[PDB]
Symmetry: D3
Subunit: 244 residues, 6 copies
C-alpha cells in the first residue's frame, strides 16, 4: 500500500562497517539518504535503532554480567545511535527531527511521551526512539513494533543488510531456499521461521501491523516499498506466496 505513516527499524550494525566498529560516515550517509527519500514523499517516519555496533552479549557472557544488566548497557547504545543519527539527519534536512527516550535523560533528549510523539509526527517531524522499551529480555524488534502500533503507524519496515527478504530456509547455504513475496503471521510461527522475535511478530499480528523485510543496503528499495512496489518480503495476514 502507499503508506502515510511508517516506522523504520534499524539494526545498530547498519551504522558501522563490520571491521573495527562504531560508526562509519559512509554508512550513516546511506542511512540518512534512505530515510530522507521516504520523508521527501511526505510520509511520516519514526525510527527505532539497535545498539549492536556498540555493545554485544558476547562480552556480557564473558564476564557473567546479569542479563538484565547487559540489556541496560545495550539500551544506552541505542540512545547513542539515536543521537548520532539525528546529527547526521539534521545536516541533510531542514525538517525537524526529534529524539525521544524511554529513560528520560532530558537535556540530552526529550523524555518519551506518546501523544507528544504522535503530535510531532503529525506536525511532520522525524522522530527517533532510543532506549527501546526500557524493558529486559527483549530485542530491538519488539519495542519497535510496540511503538509502531502506539504511533498509529501504517507499516513497519524492518531493514536488513544483504538479505533481500524472508526465505524458506537460510540461502547462505541451501541451493534452493525461496523467498516469500508474502508471509502469513501464524505461518511464520507455525513453520518456526527465524526472522524477527516471536513476541514482536505476535503483537504485530494481534494489531494488524504489516511488516516488510528487505535489503536496506540496496539503494531505493525502501522507497519502492512505500510507493507500493513488491520488493522483499511482506508479512501480513494475507495468505503466503513466494517469489518465482
Amino acid at each position: 500500500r502507499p503508506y502515510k505513516r511508517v516506522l523504520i527499524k534499524l539494526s545498530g550494525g547498519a551504522l558501522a562497517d563490520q571491521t573495527g566498529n562504531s560508526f562509519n560516515s559512509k554508512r550513516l550517509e546511506h542511512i540518512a539518504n534512505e530515510i530522507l527519500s521516504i520523508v521527501d514523499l511526505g510520509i511520516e517516519v519514526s525510527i527505532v535503532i539497535g545498539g549492536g555496533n556498540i555493545f554485544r552479549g558476547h562480552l556480557a557472557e564473558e564476564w557473567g554480567i546479569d542479563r538484565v544488566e547487559a540489556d541496560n548497557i545495550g539500551t544506552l547504545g541505542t540512545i547513542i545511535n539515536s543521537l548520532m543519527l539525528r546529527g547526521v539527519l539534521t545536516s541533510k534536512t531542514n525538517k525537524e527531527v526529534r529524539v525521544m527516550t524511554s529513560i528520560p535523560f532530558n537535556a540530552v533528549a526529550e523524555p518519551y511521551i506518546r501523544l507528544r510523539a504522535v503530535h510531532h509526527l503529525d506536525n511532520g517531524y522525524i522522530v527517533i526512539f532510543g532506549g527501546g522499551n526500557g524493558q529486559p529480555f527483549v530485542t530491538t524488534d519488539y519495542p519497535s513494533v510496540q511503538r509502531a502500533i502506539e504511533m498509529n503507524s501504517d507499516a513497519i519496515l524492518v531493514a536488513k543488510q544483504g538479505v533481500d527478504g524472508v526465505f524458506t530456509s537460510d540461502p547462505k547455504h541451501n541451493k534452493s531456499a525461496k523467498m516469500y513475496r508474502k508471509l502469513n503471521y501464524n505461518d511464520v510461527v507455525r513453520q518456526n521461521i527465524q526472522v524477527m522475535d516471536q513476541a514482536a511478530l505476535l503483537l504485530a499480528r494481534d494489531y494488524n501491523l504489516p511488516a516488510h523485510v528487505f535489503n536496506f543496503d540496496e539503494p531505493g528499495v525502501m522507497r519502492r516499498i512505500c510507493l507500493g512496489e513488491h520488493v522483499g518480503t511482506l508479512i501480513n495476514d494475507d495468505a503466503s506466496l513466494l517469489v518465482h
Copy 2:
C-alpha cells in the same frame, strides 16, 4: 604518602585495544586487576572513566554536531564504560561496587548523591562515577578532580597509557626530554605543560589534591604509588624535581 582514599581516572581508550574498538577483555581484566590490587590494601577507591573507546569528536566535526551535543553523546559512553567495568569488577571481587550517574538513569545506575557516595566509600564499597559532571566544554580530567575533592580523596591517580609520567617536552621527539619526579602546579601552568586540563589542574591546586601521572599499562605501578613508592610523576605544591 600511604593513601586511605583515592580516585582513579581512567580514559575510555584504556578499555579497548586501538585496532577496531569498544572493549577488550584482556584490557578489562588488566584494569580490574590493577584496581583490585589497591582495594586489597583496604584503600577506598572511586573511579572516573572516559568514553573515548565509544565516541570521538572526530565524528561530531564530520557532521558538524554542536559541541554541547557531542559532549552529551560522549557522556553516555562514560556510563556504558562504568556499567561494563562494574560487571568485570563484580566477577572478581566480593566487595560491593556501585555505579553512580550525574544524569540519574535509575534502574540502570544510582543517581549520584554526594553523601551517599561518601557513605559507600566509608562502608568500603568501590564506587564508579559515570556521566562525569553533567556539564559541557569539559574533559574527563576536570570532573574527576571535582569528584575526588568532593569525596575527601587523599590523591588522584591519573592513569596514562605507554607514558611513564610527565616530561619536560614530549619524548615523542625531544630525545633528551626528562621526566619530573615532582611537578609544581603553578610550574605546570607557567611552562604551559599539556598533561591535564588547566581547569582540573587549577582546582586540584586550589584544594591541594595531589596528582600522580603514571603508566597504567605497567603491572604493579599503581600499588607501588599507594605504597609510598616514587614511580611516575607527582603533581604537588612541593617544588619541582626531576628523575636522574
Copy 3:
C-alpha cells in the same frame, strides 16, 4: 519442586466479589491467608496483581478511549490493589512487605528498582509489584512473568478462581474436557491453548520459568504446590501428561 522463591500472579477480580465491585474484606482475608501460608515456610514471595476489579476495557470501548490510554488507567488500578493488599498483609504479618511501582509515585510506594527488589526478597520481605510493566498492549500475565525472571524466581504461580487447572477444552461446557497434570510450552501454543498470554508463555519458556495454574479459591492448594504436591496444572518443558 520445593520452591524457595516464587511469584504469585493475582487477578484484580480475586479481590472483589462479582456483584457490585471493588474490594471484599472476606476475599482480601482469603488472599492474605493463602499468601502468608507460603511465606510461613520461609519461601520468598513477589506478588503481581491485576486491576480488573476497578477498571475494564468494557468502558474504554464504550467511550472509544485509545487502547494505550485505557491501559494506563487499568495500570493505576494495579497500584491501588497493591497498596490495599499491603494494608491487609501488614495487619496479619510482622514481616516487611514492600510495594514497588513501575511508575515511581514515591511517598506512595517505592520506585521499582531490580537489585533493590532482589535485595528485599533476599532479606525475607514480601514485595508487591504495581503498575505492571509500564507498557501497553499487554496483560497482567506478561509483566508478571517478566518480573518473576528478573527476580530469579523458581516458579510462577498463576492463581485462578474456580478453574482447577488447564483443560483440553473449556469444561464449563464439554462433557469431556480433561485437565493436564503437565503441559508443555510449545504444546500450549501448538494446540492454540488459551490460558495465559502467548507472549508471557513464550518468555517463560525461553527462560525456563515453570508455571502452575490452579484454584486459588480452594484453601491450601498454593501450599501443596510449593510443598511439591501435584495439584492443578504444571507448565513445563517436560512432556505433556493428563489427570486420570
Copy 4:
C-alpha cells in the same frame, strides 16, 4: 455573575450509580453534557473530581491502614476518574482536554504546573486536576478551592447530588428546613454548617472565591448559574438571604 473562568468540583460518587460501583456510562454522559453546556458559552473550565466511587475509608478502618496511607490510595482514584472523564469528554468535544496531576505520573497525564495550567485555560482547553493537592488529612473540597484560586477562577461550582443547595438544617429530618439563596462565609462557620470543609471555606473566604452549591443531577442548572440565574445556594461575603 456571568463567569469567565470556573472550577467545577465533582465527587467521585457522581461517576457511579450507588448499586455495585465504579463508573456508570449514563452518569458519565450526564457529567460530560453538563460540562460541555458551560464551555459551549466559552467559559473556561477546570474540574476536580473525588475518588469515592473507587475507594472509601470504610475499608481503611476495617484493616487499620494509616490515615495518610488511605489518603494516597484514595488519591490515585481521583487520577483514574480524571483519565476516564477526559476520555468521555474527548468523545463529545473537539476542544482540547488536559489532565494534570499533582503527582507527576507522566506518559499517563501531565505533571501539574500552574502557569501551564493557566495557559491552557487561556487557550480555551478544558483542564482536569487529579491527585488533588498531594497532601493528606484533606478532602476534595480544599484542593479544589486552592486550584480554583490558583487558576484565577471567577467562582467554584460545588456540584451536589439530590440536594438543591444549603439548608438551615438538613431536610433529612427537619421538615421545615429552609434553603439559603445566599450564605455568608463567617455565618457558615458560626452556625457550624456542614456543607464543605472548614479549611476550604476559610480559604475561599480569605481570597473571596464565591461558591455555588446546587443539584448537579438536574439538567441545566449549572448553566443557569453561569448565565446569572439564582438557583441553588451562593456562598458569599454578601449577607445571608433565604429562599421563599
Copy 5:
C-alpha cells in the same frame, strides 16, 4: 505532660536579629542550644522553619508578584534556613540531623518521604523539614501541624519571640490583657483569636494535636514545657483557664 515526640515550629525571624537581616550566629546558637536541651532528654525532634529572615510579601506587593509566585520564593527561604540550621546543629551534636524537602532538591537535601521521616525519628535522628507543604496560600503554621500529625507527634511547640503566650487581647495596647494557662480550640476560633492560622488550628483540633505557644527567646522554657511544667500557653480541647 512528658512527650516522647515533638514538632518545633520556628519562624524565620528568630534566626536573624531585626536590624539588617539574614542570620545572626548569636541567635543561631541560642536556637541550637534550646533544641539540643530537648533532644538531650531523648525526646524525638522534628523542626519546621519559616523563611521570613530572607523574604517577605512586603516586596511581592511592591512589584505585584502573584501570591502563588511570592510563596514559591518564600519557600526556598525555608530550605536555606533548614540547611543552615543543620550546619549549626551538626557542629554541636553528634546526633544525626536530616534535612527533608517537599520539593526534592536531592544532593542538597533528601526528598521528603513520610515513613522515612518517621523511621529517622525512630532511630533518634533530628529531622528538619524545609519547603513547608509545597502548597500556596498557606503559612508556616499549617504545614508544621500537618507534618506533626504525619509524624505521630505528641505535641507541637510553637516558639514565639517576645510574647510569653496567648493573651486575651494584645498587651502592647491592652494593659490588663491576661495570658491563658490553657486555651480551647473552639474557643480560639469563637473569640477569633489571632495566634496561629485558623486552618492550622482546626487541623490540630481535628487530630487532637496539642500546641504550646511560648517565649523561645527565654532560655530553658522549651525544656520546662517538655518536662511537664506549665509555662506559656497550652492549646487543648480541655477547658480554657487563665494565669493568675
Copy 6:
C-alpha cells in the same frame, strides 16, 4: 562592537544595599532599568545572578559547614534572586522573561534545557539562569561564562559595583594604578590578575567569548558598551591596551 546576544553576570550584592541585607527596591529598580535599556535595542539577554546578598561563606566557616554544603545553600540564593528579579522585570516590561534552573524545581521555575533556552532567546524572551552550574567549588563567574557559550552569546558583560574596569593593581592602594582599555586573556593569567575566576577566564579564552568589566552602578554604561563604545575594560585575545 554591536552584539545581538549577550549574557549579563550580576553579583547578588548588587541587589542589596550593604547595610542590613537582602533586597533593596531602589537597587532592584536600577538593575531592571539597565537591563531593559539593552533589550529595548532588541539585543537578546540572558542573566546570571549570584546569591551573595543572602548567603556567604562567612558563616559556613563559622560553623564549619562542608564547602560542598555551603555552595548548595549559596545556590538556592541565586534561584531566589532570579525569581525576585523576574518579578521586578515583569512589572516594567511586556516582554516574556523566563527563569530556568539547573536544579529543576518545577512549578517554581522551568528546568533548564539548552535548546529551550536558545529558543526562548531566539523568540525575544529575557532568560534568567538560577542555581548556576549545579556544581561545587565554583563561583558565579564560571557557570555564567559556560551558559554564555552554550547560548551562543556574542559577549559576557560582567557588571561590577564601584570599580569602572580592570586595573594594573587595585586602586584603593595603588594611587597610580591604570585601567586597561583592552586586556588579553593570557596576559590576565600571566600577571596573575584577580578580576574573575581563572577557570572562567580560560573557558572564555578557549571559546573566544569576549568579556566586559564595568561599573554597573553607573547609569547608561551597559548600553554604551553594547552600542560599540569603549567604556570599562574589554577582555579579548586582541593585544592589551590601557586608558590614557
